[PDB]
Amino acid sequence: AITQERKNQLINEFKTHESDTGSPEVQIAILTDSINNLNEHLRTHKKDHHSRRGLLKMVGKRRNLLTYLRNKDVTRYRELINKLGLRR
RNA sequence: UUAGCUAGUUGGUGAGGUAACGGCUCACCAAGGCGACGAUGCGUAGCCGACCUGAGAGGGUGAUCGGCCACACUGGGACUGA
RNA sequence: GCGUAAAGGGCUCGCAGGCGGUUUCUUAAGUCUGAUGUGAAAGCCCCCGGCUCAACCGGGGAGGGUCAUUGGAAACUGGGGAACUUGAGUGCAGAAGAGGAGAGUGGAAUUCCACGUGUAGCGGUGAAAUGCGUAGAGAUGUGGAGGAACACCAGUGGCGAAGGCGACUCUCUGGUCUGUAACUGACGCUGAGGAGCGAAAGCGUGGGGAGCGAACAGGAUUAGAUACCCUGGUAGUCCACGCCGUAAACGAUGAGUGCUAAGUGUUAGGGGGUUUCCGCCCCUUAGUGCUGCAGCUAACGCAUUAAGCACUCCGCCUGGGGAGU
RNA sequence: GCCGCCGAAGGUGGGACAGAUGAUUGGGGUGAAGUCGUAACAAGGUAGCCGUAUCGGAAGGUGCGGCUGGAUCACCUCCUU
RNA sequence: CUACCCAUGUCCAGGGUGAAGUUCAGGUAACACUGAAUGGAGGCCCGAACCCACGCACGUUGAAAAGUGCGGGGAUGAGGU
RNA sequence: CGGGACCUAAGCCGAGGCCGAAAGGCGUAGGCGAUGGACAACAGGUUGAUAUUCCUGUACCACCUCCUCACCAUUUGAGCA
RNA sequence: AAGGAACUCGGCAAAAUGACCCCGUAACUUCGGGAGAAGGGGUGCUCUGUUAGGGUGCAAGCCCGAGAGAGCCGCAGUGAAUAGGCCCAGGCGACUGUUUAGCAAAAACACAGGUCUCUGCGAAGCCGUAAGGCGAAGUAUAGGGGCUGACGCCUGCCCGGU
RNA sequence: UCCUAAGGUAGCGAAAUUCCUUGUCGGGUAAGUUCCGACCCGCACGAAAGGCGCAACGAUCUGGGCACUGUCUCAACGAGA
């Protein structure tokens, strides 16, 4: 992926500022959903090591941004984590 | 080419004990605690002021004098007494 | 210190750890400084005196601490709060590729088979022989089966972390660079362990076996031929599922960042000068090749893709054999 | 005086670790003078080397992939003129 | 009778060992993975009824033309009946 | 109550049928054949001898109507089915 | 008694060990074991004490009871009967099983696994003189035949003979 | 060097394979014609008439120890048939 309905749809459903395309909660949202769909799409044919290395790098980047948002705002980071679902 | 260790062990309460806190020792309760910042285990060794050497940083020894610890044929024990 | 002498981990992802853009208020945790305590004596050093001097003795000093207690400075590292944007990330629009995984399809060529046509050789070599051929071979014509690899484009081209990746089409997917520049506001760099991938040979099972082909068979060359050569030929190569985790895994150069003469190629882009075109030329990135200044060096050589110049971090090196035993 | 608690030495047991010594045997070192080859350094007589697999009295051979640390053409990039 | 088959019934006292599988807690990005509890499969283990027939002794014109007494193996299966 | 006036398993017999000197071998439709499936009764007494049988109280099973009632319908049909 | 395998081809045979609870348990491995490994300690009774705590019950009441402290007595505390003796090191065979009823249970045979081979189904082999039927209401991942016997490492050379 | 088609490779080896033989050496013993370990002279091992190792199991087979005993040194009482 991600589909445009989830790129603009997910950024529209999780926009932190009114015109903020970034806002690292938004980067954790788009990178998180794209990492999930890349997780099933990697699991569909479990031999492709190239796409797997992409899944490891992407999931690691989403983890580093998750720790960054956790260090940037405590309660908002807990609300973004418990709202998103992952990190548990 | 030692990653396990620990069960009075980790901690509580209670009692006893000694000059004195303390699992110091026991009863009862809990399941703790230490570890890559090296636990435990093997090895070696009294440590220090200092001495010798080096331009200095460092490297080596703990003789003789002194300060503390230990031991008194080997291994326990308690009495007298401050 | 590590391109060639010993020394870059095969390569990546990441936790702990180590290090970190600019402005501003506080702090003293480090950093630094003043006061007290204490660092016993003897000893080392400085300054005197006494044994005829000296060794020595004695007196007078000094110095020795991530040391405590305590007072200041806030420049720098850090703690905390506020900030900002090039770093890094998201967005928007472009570009590109043999990056990967799965399915399907297509030819050229070799083998084999069936039948026609035809005869006496085919084959191989340095020269021959083994082998095949009158059971009709080679060649040639037609058709069928099956496997493996895709010629031309194709190139010190492209992509990928590396090993590596090539016929064509589709699904699913990662990544790179360019361009303004909407947002975020340091969210980064490395990273021992740990995790993961890693040619070819192998290893287990089950498939597949057209070519190639260790071991093996025969003939040749030689004094000898357990080799070179030729004729054959098993495993393997192929596939799927698992283990193997080594290579001259090479650029014998770890990653990241900043700077420092130039020229000439070459893809992937962008801005532009006029240009409807086209095309030339400049500026610009990114990637990659050659030629070379400074600088490095033992010499070869490297040289904006450094082995230059500095910073962060990891790994490796301490004569050879013994012995990677 | 008797009895209870713990208590050293000792005994019993199964372990662990370390050192001596052991018929033989494996690799290595050094050396008498030795017997077999000529593998490697020239294109070293088949270019080596690296990893792996098998075979060989042995240096080694051969297969697979990789590298030039490859003598050298001859394509060839694209080098100074 | 016995060897085998086929059809249909029946028997196997009690207690242990603990897997696969699950659930929970931890764990990764999901897996993996790890531990607790749950779990009862198995020609598993012990051992009686039962079946067998390895020891020994006896008996040997025997209680008996194959047994008896002490012991013994199997004892949810390839089982006995 | 066990068994037959119920059914069937391996098997057996088997009209017709098929093969084969003969005798017979096999086998269809059929039928037999429990160790199976279906299935209504029980608690006491009792003798020198029989019992979920005799007997004393309850029951149960199927069939049929000299009888009694209840309810339908008269083939535009109760019911057997 | 005392000595203990000197008897004997041979510890044949007897003697011995044994029940629970607890501690503790090696080499080796296929990671499950081995292993009831080995080697040890406790148990009888009285009281505290209708113990602690459970099952059951409304209470009453029974049952089921660890754990301990005091104390008793004996040579002896699962006092009796029935309940494993172990531990090294070898050869063979993976194993549990099966066989010579009535001498030989074993190192024999079986066995999963491994292979070589045949067979396309009115079948290969079967029993039949044939009919019929097994194989089978099976279909080359299935049947029949042979060889060898888990597992691990392998399975070297000769097609002259037959 | 002669012959065959080829001359047995690995791994084992005085084994259930070995006659000379009790092959030689070492361990175990006081003394070990069996046993364990290796040397290889394999009379007459050897790779699916499998070779070689192999935890678990044997009513197998064979050495060696602990405990324990009438197995005996050497028997002697006592109870039943």
Query: Chain centroid to CA A67: how far?
Result: 13
**Exposed, middle or buried by CB within 10 Å (0-12, 13-18, 19+), for A57?**
exposed
Closest nucleotide over all strands to A69 (CA to C1'): C187
Query: Which runs of consecutive H residues, i.e. helices, occur in A1-88?
Result: 4-13, 25-43, 49-72, 74-84
CA distance A54 to A51: 5
Q: Is A66 exposed, middle or buried (0-12, 13-18, 19+ CB in 10 A)?
A: buried
Question: What is the Cα–Cα distance from A76 to A74, expressed in whole angstroms?
Answer: 6
CB A35 within 8 A of CB A59: yes
Alpha-carbon distances, residue A51 vs A6, A37, A56, A77 (angstroms)? 21, 12, 9, 29
CB A38 within 8 A of CB A32: no
* Total residues found in chain A within this entry: 88
Q: Answer yes or no: is A66 CB < 7 A from strand C.
A: no
Solved with = cryo-EM
Residues (20-59, chain A) with CB within 7 Å of strand C atoms = 20-24, 26-27, 30-31, 34, 37-38, 41-42, 44-45, 47-58
